Amino acid sequence: GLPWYRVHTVVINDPGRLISVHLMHTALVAGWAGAMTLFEIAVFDPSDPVLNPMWRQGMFVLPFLTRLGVTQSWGGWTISGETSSNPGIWSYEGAAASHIVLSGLLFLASVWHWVYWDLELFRDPRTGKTALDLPKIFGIHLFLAGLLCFGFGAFHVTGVFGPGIWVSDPYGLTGSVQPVAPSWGAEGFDPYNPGGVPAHHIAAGILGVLAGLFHLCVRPSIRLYFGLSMGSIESVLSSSIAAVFWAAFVVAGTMWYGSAATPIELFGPTRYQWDQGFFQQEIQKRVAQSTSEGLSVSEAWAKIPEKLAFYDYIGNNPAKGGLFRTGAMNSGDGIAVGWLGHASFKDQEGRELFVRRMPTFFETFPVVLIDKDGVVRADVPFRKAESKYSIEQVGVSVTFYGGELNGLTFTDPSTVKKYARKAQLGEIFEFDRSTLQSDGVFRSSPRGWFTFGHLSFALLFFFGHIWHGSRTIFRDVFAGIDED
Amino acid sequence: MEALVYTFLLIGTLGIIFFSIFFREPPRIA
Amino acid sequence: KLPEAYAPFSPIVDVLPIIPVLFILLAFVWQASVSFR
Amino acid sequence: AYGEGANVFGRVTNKSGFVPYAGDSFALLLPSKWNPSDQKEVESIVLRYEDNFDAVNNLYVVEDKSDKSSIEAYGTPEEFISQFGYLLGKQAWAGQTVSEGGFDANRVSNAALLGVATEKDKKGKTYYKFEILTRTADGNEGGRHQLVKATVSNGKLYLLKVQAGDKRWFKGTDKECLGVLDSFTVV
Amino acid sequence: RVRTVLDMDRKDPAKEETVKELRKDINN
Amino acid sequence: TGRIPLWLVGTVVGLLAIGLLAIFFYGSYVGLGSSL
Amino acid sequence: MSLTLILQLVALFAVVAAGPLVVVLLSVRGGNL
């Protein structure tokens, strides 16, 4: 009479059916990978890599497929924006079909390993009872894991046999799948240095092999064997749950903060690029350099790439989103069509005014136009009676350099107020919202959703470590206690 | 149509409460 | 204020009102004196 | 200093509530609880302080060159205060309204001149003093009291303006505002 | 040639939290 | 160890604690933190 | 320091000690508590 929450304990003491259920979970995961890839390819728009990349459309597995080398498709389109001459069998559709067929094969193998559960391999040769030599199993599977880690690091990513991984410029303007040379110096521990990824996966992998050869040759000591409850599968479950939630915390942190393994051309910008003005400073530095060359403001701003300006927009901030604001970023805000340009606000005196940008914390932010010396010179007041820094009172005009509105100046207060309100969000873009019926509230980029999901899983699996490990240590008393 | 869904959910919860009160399994002594 | 005759006795009047809350504490002290018998 | 020691069983420094301040050519007393402010609504503002609690309570000193030889050259004090009509803000609203009580048609703000006068000084200097009450359609803080003290010396006009909410004015900000107005002394 | 002082004075009004302002702030 | 009965010790310690609390309230009404 | 404060402290100490003093006197005397 097992309660509904204990049913899957039936395979605790059955190695064969444990293999079967683990095969079934593996088959389900592979099937989900294939199906998700197929759905994403079906609903993906590859026409415009600029202003409409993958992270704008809510793609979740496309970033990873592109990160590890798969770029082309059988539909004739490349994620980089070129033409697919010969995508080969390793296109997105190829990966989806492969993971799907693997899921089916694992389903069949699960059926078999379930029917023929009573294999003599799982019998203890001496006693004849069913038993698993957990130290030796860990040694074998760790040796395999280390071998695979070294192989992936040395051949893949380095491009010796594999294709490499996604490497981009610091500002995410020109990124592509490239081979990576390992970084053997201290800079190999720079999180944003790509060269660490091969070298690590090499060196660590090597250690794994050696570690395997130890945990496969040397039997654990009796004191350690009974202390760590080696020989109980639930102890292994507790330790594995702990390790996996540790890894989940690490990956969530490394994606929220960004690293060489989570490029912004695949997951979108981080919130710390908006907070610290990572792109705004670069744009203004390029503009200033062009001006120092003698160019006018219009030419200097026309020289700015549209993708770089698009990164400098608060709508792409992963932290400007909602828990139930579902779907693609294009579903909340319209599909980007073009860059309006750069708005320069100037009072009737000629003093240049800058619009205070919305911080990541604020859902709504009042519009303030600030002097170069940090002195508020204009605003859109909430109380139009006896206002002091009104747009009409100060006489603010907005001139657009570059983009769609190039060399266009607006002086009517309504248009100036509208454009200042738009510019408080960063660079101003035109959005087509009729196509997807965008409501008008920002969604979160795929890196935000990934971080949220895997952080919640990390917490729940910390509770899993606690529970399954308590059950491990207190196995004798978890069938009941004999009073004191 | 959302109001219909909300009303159905509330009615379902109230019906579950009614069944758990008046159609409960008797508490078996010993 | 108090009539000018009673002006020097102002501190006593300023202290008086807290005695009622001292009585309950005295009851607790008395109970403790008998080991809370 | 690091070895200065504490003020155990000591004495306070000052409890008057006002602290002195020396300007370019003027002296003033500011409320202790009022903090210095950075914003300059008028480019000629040379000093500004604001209340810590309610930012409506503030004051600022404006020093700007004047062609008039003396403050009397502006004319009557009422004419002078009519000259500076922009200090009371600007009505950005421009819609036809008649559904606001106590206001003329198409108006949402109104300034009432409670009184004007002329003051003296230890050197015989003449100061124009003004008290205004500005009300708005929303009645923000039940109106705002404005105290203005203006003088002309050495070819420059000095104008101190103190603003206090009526809600704050009723419950004791009048003392601080009047102290600020009284302490304003120019060479 | 870029005027770093003007660059910082442009970033500060739009965003005071910019890494341009905070870097070598005590030097200013 | 029967000398100095425990109730007397408790009463004296409680009196000292109440006195300390009263001193803290007094300091709340004067000096630093008194809003004047 | 203030004379009023001195007298207040004296009166407070007297009234506070009044209760414990009578309790102690009755305990040492043997009165029925």
Place this chain on the structure above:
Amino acid sequence: IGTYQEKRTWFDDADDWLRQDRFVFVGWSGLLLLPCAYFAVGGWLTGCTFVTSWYTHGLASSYIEGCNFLTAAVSTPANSLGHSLLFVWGPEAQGDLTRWFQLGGLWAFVALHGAFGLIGFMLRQFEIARSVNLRPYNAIAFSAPIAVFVSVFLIYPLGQSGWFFAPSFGVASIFRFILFFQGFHNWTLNPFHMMGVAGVLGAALLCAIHGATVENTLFEDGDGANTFRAFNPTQAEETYSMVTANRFWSQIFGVAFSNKRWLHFFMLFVPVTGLWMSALGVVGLALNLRAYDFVSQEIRAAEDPEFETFYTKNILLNEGIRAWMAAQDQPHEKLTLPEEVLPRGNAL
């Protein structure tokens, strides 16, 4: 151990000493709990007594500055330090203990020592339960406070721009944190704080109801009007009538417990689940995945200038909180907002 005990090792002597039943059980977990917890509490007391927040939040938050128990608080460091661990030897303080206090490093000190103290305390619960051979359900229950502490004081600040937005260790500082959450994240509308509120209120309800029901269904077992004396710790019979309680609550409320084990498991279960759901919600807020708005109602209000609900009024309240608290709550932003841009009602 199992086949034989082999020879006694120095680990055996250490275990025997640490596992003695003295007044304060130290155990192996004590070596991590006692120093860490002691330093955390002592650091909080020193900070609330002597350390100030004038350079971190521009606020006076110590006793020596004139603050009381309510307003004193070990404030979190400046936002410009980001998520720096603020080691006293680190590149920020560079060894200057006084300046390390001034920079706000005491907050990081207290937070990290408190986290390791909580780890040590759950380890202590496990060790003590194993010593007396009991199922360690109280450690499993204590996992919920650890989840809350981790999600609020560690995960949330790491999701934001720095430690500055963590809760400062204090009473009024915690109240500021709560109001900040209401204003910015609209935390009340989040279904996970809803589940946490339900869990905590239900746990309080269960505590009160179980206590009252037991105290009001007691068997006589004595002749004194003081029912507390009529109990022996070693007695086997139950001190209260389960049948009477079940009948009473069945006829009063409609349903009633009939199993003591299930009743006490439910008492354990409700608050833990509530706190865990609240922790998940706080993680979501750490990523700014806030349940801020119902887009349908916002769109309807935008199209219909006369549609109003309590939700829209709450949104207006949040807007007011944000606008009027931003200038002084986040000094690093340098928000010199003129009084005309702050949202405001009529005549207030």
Place this chain on the structure above:
Amino acid sequence: SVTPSLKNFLLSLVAGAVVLAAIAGAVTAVSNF
């Protein structure tokens, strides 16, 4: 070494090792009495 922060980090490791060894030695000394 090269960086002052690295020297401070290494000294922090040394100090933590010192305090950890102090705790271990204290427990050993009290266990053997």
Place this chain on the structure above:
Amino acid sequence: ERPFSDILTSIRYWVIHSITVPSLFIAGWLFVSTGLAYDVFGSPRPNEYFTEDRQDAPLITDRFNALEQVKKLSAQ
């Protein structure tokens, strides 16, 4: 372990502690009064919150060199 009642009612304990508890209390009073508390914990004195040029609250606004920034912002 002796019961707490025996120790707290023992005259020896009180004669031992009657010169140490006041000693600790007086040590704390001296620590506050002699200005040592401000000196070691860095909390500014009531006349040291604002300097000649800094008439507002300080702001750290720097990750590294924060030692120099807080040193120049603090009372000299």
Place this chain on the structure above:
Amino acid sequence: IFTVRWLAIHAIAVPTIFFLGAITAMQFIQR
């Protein structure tokens, strides 16, 4: 004596009395 309970009592007593003296002295500071 100097037992574990002695250390546990005196680790929370001596600092407590020192801080009580410090706070009492703070109560008599004039700004």
